[PDB]
Design a protein around this nucleic acid. Structure first.
Lengths: 82, 135, 25, 213, 175
RNA sequence: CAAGACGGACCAGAGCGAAAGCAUUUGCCAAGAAUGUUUUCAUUAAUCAAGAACGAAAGUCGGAGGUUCGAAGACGAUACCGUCGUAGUUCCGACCAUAAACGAUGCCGACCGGCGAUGCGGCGGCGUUAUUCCCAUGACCCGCCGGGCAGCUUCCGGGAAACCAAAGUCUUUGGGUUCCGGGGGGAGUAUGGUUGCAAAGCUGAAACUUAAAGGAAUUGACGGAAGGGCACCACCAGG
């Protein structure tokens, strides 16, 4: 009550806050590598992608856009970057 | 005279009791409802518009129709309640309950009670004004 | 109760009232 | 000046063979005095008979309209005309913190009895639910309504009135829709609340013999 | 035998459970009648037996639990058991005047009165009992007494102030 | 069998729309809020006169239909009430543009309390269900974020008080900008101008008169009213 340091917020408190309302704003999204089970090629996709992403050679659907994050196809694998 | 039915089993009719807000009708028919047997109002029992919707008039009407049906041989009735319905009130009043109690008191067996009143889905405009009420 | 009010409204109160009015050697 | 009920006489009306209890009662009909025949006067008589008056152990809130058009010498023969639910059940079944979903179809059967079906279902509260209200969104209501139409049409259109009425006796259609809509929004009290009879074909007397025995 | 069924709503289940003793004891003791609470169908089942006489009691007993369904207290439905010509009459508030929204709520508040006081007065004057539902009004009493209380209630939703109706309803019961 | 009307219950601490308003199913048509965003432009913004768009109900013109209700009117009782009922109520097409059209409360912005409910979107997560669902997905449950709608509460401060989360951050008085008021009558009157076929709509005085006009709460009183009590200096039955 009435006494908490604003310059050093706890990381769970900073994670909980809205992305614009943090001490310095930072997005909630990320780029990830996706591998189709029908091939071996890696593709870089945005987590909140609005476009349907197709494989370069297989031309399978990799992600379907939704309200928030994109729905990766059942079977593909992914790994978050950085 | 009467149905050729043994002592063990009775004969079913139906009885429409219509409790309007000025009097109460007792209209007994067969199970189809086409052919009628008796119908006694508040006016044929009392010669006074005071007691036209009275529970006492409905009691006399129910006793009259019960003894008439036992004379003819209808010894059990399904009962269909009714209010005036429509834009008006939808609930059976004290006259209907009085008639039901009185023809239950007569010893004649009562069947199934069903409240059959014309509740609209949606209907037309109310009888009163935007201001007009009972009193 | 409603029955008690109807019965007590059609009956008469009775009982309590006292009037103060009015050897060996 | 003279009592007409002494002139009248009693006739017997009996239920068809789909029901356990068959003797549904009596009807008072005028005798023929040459002007009008009794058969024409009893050729159109609709009876509002509850299901528990037609079967012993069944429920009572289900009412069947049976239409009578036949005479066999103090034996009236009747046939199905409609089905409906009692006003008590319909009033008690519409609660508050829940949605009412209702639908209707116009459908022809296998033997010409065109009919209209009305059914009602209600959104259901889960057993671990602590939210007061169990409301379905608009698209779920539309999907549920489409599923109701499809299910009722599929088990009315492919069968005859014997099989249709023996479906209506335990209301397998309502439990079928209740099982089928568990994945859109769970349902509560699904009944075919009304069955109409929009059209009757040309009368055949042998089918009444099949329906009665 | 004879049997009656009474549907109980979901909001009336807890008072039905908490007052059940003084529901079934006045039916099994001095009416000689059988009753059960069918939980699956959510109904009150009332049936006769070999221990019952004065058959109208059955019908009268039916009205008893029906009053406790509609919100009346146990004592007033007990009065329906004891007395012979008692009636319950029902009407909607919109059945006399079209009232929308806040006007309907204000009409309810005038019928109830501050602290409940006004409605108590009408009961205490007319020897009736009045249950105000969400919109429905139910009046339990004799036919003339129902007429008096119904006129007073309709005057309260006539728009008249509760004070004029209070004084006038105290005056009219002297006939 | 038909004709028009209305879409009850479900229907809310609700939702949508700039407001007026909006509740039967289905198909079509073009818009939109909120949310998600490591898209795009780069200051494009706020407030505003005239004018324009829609604007409840009633009402004015052309048609169609008239089921209910119902101004006027005709009766019957006693301004209330009942019977019949015209215009109207409904639909289309032009008008008129007024409401207690309310939060009796310009708009845009910053800072400033609690509780636990709700609507939509999104995020994270065990479990129970779709007759142990054979994976996702619906339906619940737990937690969070974002705008919304709305309860109860508050030594936040403020107020004349009712009360207020703004009506607070105001004699410790300055974030930007519009309208409007200056004691009560005369008076929304007369006049001048403008608009409207018209009805009327906008604008709009003074001479003179007056010491009050008005607001917020709470109970002092208050002729009376409703219950009891006692009394042969009151009554009943009597002498």
């Amino acid at each position: 009550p009435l006494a908490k340091d604003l310059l050093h917020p706890s990381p769970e408190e900073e994670k909980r806050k809205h992305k614009k309302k943090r001490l310095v704003q930072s997005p909630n999204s990320y780029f990830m590598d996706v591998k189709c089970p029908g091939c071996y090629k890696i593709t870089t996709v945005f987590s909140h992608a609005q476009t349907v992403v197709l494989c370069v050679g297989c031309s399978t659907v990799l992600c379907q856009p939704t309200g928030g994050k994109a729905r990766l196809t059942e079977g593909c694998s992914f790994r978050r970057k950085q | 005279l009467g149905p050729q039915v043994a002592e063990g089993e009775n004969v079913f009719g139906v009885c429409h009791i219509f409790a309007s807000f000025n009097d109460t009708f007792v209209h007994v028919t067969d199970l189809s409802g086409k052919e009628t047997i008796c119908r006694v109002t508040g006016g044929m029992k009392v010669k006074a518009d005071r007691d036209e919707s009275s529970p006492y008039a409905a009691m006399l009407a129910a006793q009259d129709v019960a003894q008439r049906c036992k004379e003819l041989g209808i010894t059990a009735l399904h009962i269909k309640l009714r209010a005036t319905g429509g834009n008006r009130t939808k609930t059976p009043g004290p006259g209907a309950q009085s008639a039901l109690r009185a023809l239950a008191r007569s010893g004649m067996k009562i069947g199934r009670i069903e409240d059959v009143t014309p509740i609209p889905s949606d209907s037309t405009r109310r009888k009163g004004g935007r201001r007009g009420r009972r009193l | 109760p409603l029955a008690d009010q109807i019965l007590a409204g059609n009956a008469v109160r009775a009982g309590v009232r006292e009037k103060r009015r009015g050897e060996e050697y | 000046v003279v009592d007409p009920f002494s002139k009248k006489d009693w006739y017997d009306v009996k239920a068809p063979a789909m029901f356990n209890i068959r003797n549904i009662g009596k009807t008072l009909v005028t005798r023929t005095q040459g002007t009008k025949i009794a058969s024409d006067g009893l050729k159109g008589r609709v009876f509002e008979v509850s299901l528990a008056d037609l079967q012993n152990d069944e429920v009572a809130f289900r009412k069947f309209k049976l239409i009578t058009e036949d005479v066999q010498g103090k034996n009236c023969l009747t046939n199905f005309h409609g089905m409906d639910l009692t006003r008590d059940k319909m009033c008690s079944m519409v609660k508050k913190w829940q949605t009412m979903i209702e639908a209707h179809v116009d459908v022809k059967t296998t033997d010409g009895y065109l009919l209209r079906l009305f059914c009602v279902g209600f959104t259901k509260k889960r057993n671990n639910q602590i939210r007061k209200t169990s409301y379905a969104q608009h698209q779920q209501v539309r999907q549920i309504r489409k599923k109701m139409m499809e299910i009722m049409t599929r088990e009315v259109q492919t069968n005859d009135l014997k099989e249709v009425v023996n479906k209506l006796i335990p209301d397998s259609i309502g439990k079928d829709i209740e099982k089928a809509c568990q994945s859109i929004y769970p349902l509560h009290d699904v009944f075919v609340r009304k069955v109409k009879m929009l059209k009757k074909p040309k009368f055949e007397l042998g089918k009444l013999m099949e329906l009665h025995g | 035998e004879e049997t009656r069924k009474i549907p109980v709503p979901a909001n009336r289940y807890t008072p039905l459970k908490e007052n059940w003793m003084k529901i079934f004891t006045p039916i099994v003791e001095h009416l000689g009648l059988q009753i059960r609470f069918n939980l699956k169908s959510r109904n009150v089942e009332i049936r006769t037996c070999k221990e019952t006489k004065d058959v109208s009691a059955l019908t009268k007993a039916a009205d008893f639990v029906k009053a406790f369904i509609l919100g009346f207290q146990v004592e007033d439905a007990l009065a329906l058991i004891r007395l012979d010509d008692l009636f319950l009459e029902s009407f909607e508030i919109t059945d006399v005047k079209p009232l929308k929204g806040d006007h309907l709520s204000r009409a309810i508040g005038r019928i109830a009165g501050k602290g409940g006081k006004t409605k108590f007065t009408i009961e205490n004057v007319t020897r009736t009992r009045i249950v105000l539902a969400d919109v429905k009004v139910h009046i339990l009493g004799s036919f003339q007494n129902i007429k008096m209380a119904r006129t007073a209630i309709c005057n309260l939703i006539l728009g008249n102030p509760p004070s004029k109706v209070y004084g006038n309803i105290r005056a009219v019961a002297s006939r």
